[PDB]
Amino acid sequence: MSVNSNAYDAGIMGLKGKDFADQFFADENQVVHESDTVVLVLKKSDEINTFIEEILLTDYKKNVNPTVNVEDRAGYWWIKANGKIEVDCDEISELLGRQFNVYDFLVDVSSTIGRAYTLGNKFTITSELMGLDRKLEDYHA
């Protein structure tokens, strides 16, 4: 009837504190087998923070692609996309140093998987190339 309860520090070191939760769900890092996904990681600084918000949600949300999904891991942002992605030159560069360049991105950062080619004002990074082996997908003897 009169069951008093005041915290659980007497058992928190065993109840919820001892349930081996660091061995239930892993996925800390899986292996990828021959994938044509568009990947590229950029340092998480006051630079990426803003530009990323714009660049992606501005163009990729308003009109560009529903993919270009970001993933926050240890500290840097994980920008992954399906098929191909393309960054505009004017949004980020504006906040990342107005009148900046285009190849600034994917030049030599943490990593940027995908072929980047710029044209006028807007660079596109591909990671598929339409499949280098579309007709040679298989060849034996």
From Swiss-Prot:
Record keywords: Monooxygenase, Oxidoreductase
SUPFAM superfamilies: Monooxygenase (hydroxylase) regulatory protein
Keyword Nucleus in record: no
Gene Ontology molecular-function annotations: monooxygenase activity
Any one Pfam family match given in the protein's UniProt record, by short name: MmoB_DmpM
Organism superkingdom: Bacteria
Keyword Oxidoreductase appears in the UniProt entry: yes
Job description of the protein: The B protein acts as a regulator of electron flow through the soluble mmo complex, switching the enzyme from an oxidase to a hydroxylase in the presence of the substrate.
Family classification: Belongs to the TmoD/XamoD family.
Quaternary assembly: The soluble methane monooxygenase (sMMO) consists of four components A/MMOH (composed of alpha/MmoX, beta/MmoY and gamma/MmoZ), B/MMOB (MmoB), C/MMOR (MmoC) and D/MMOD (MmoD).
Protein name according to UniProt: Methane monooxygenase regulatory protein B
Organism of this sequence: Methylococcus capsulatus (strain ATCC 33009 / NCIMB 11132 / Bath)
Name of the coding gene: mmoB
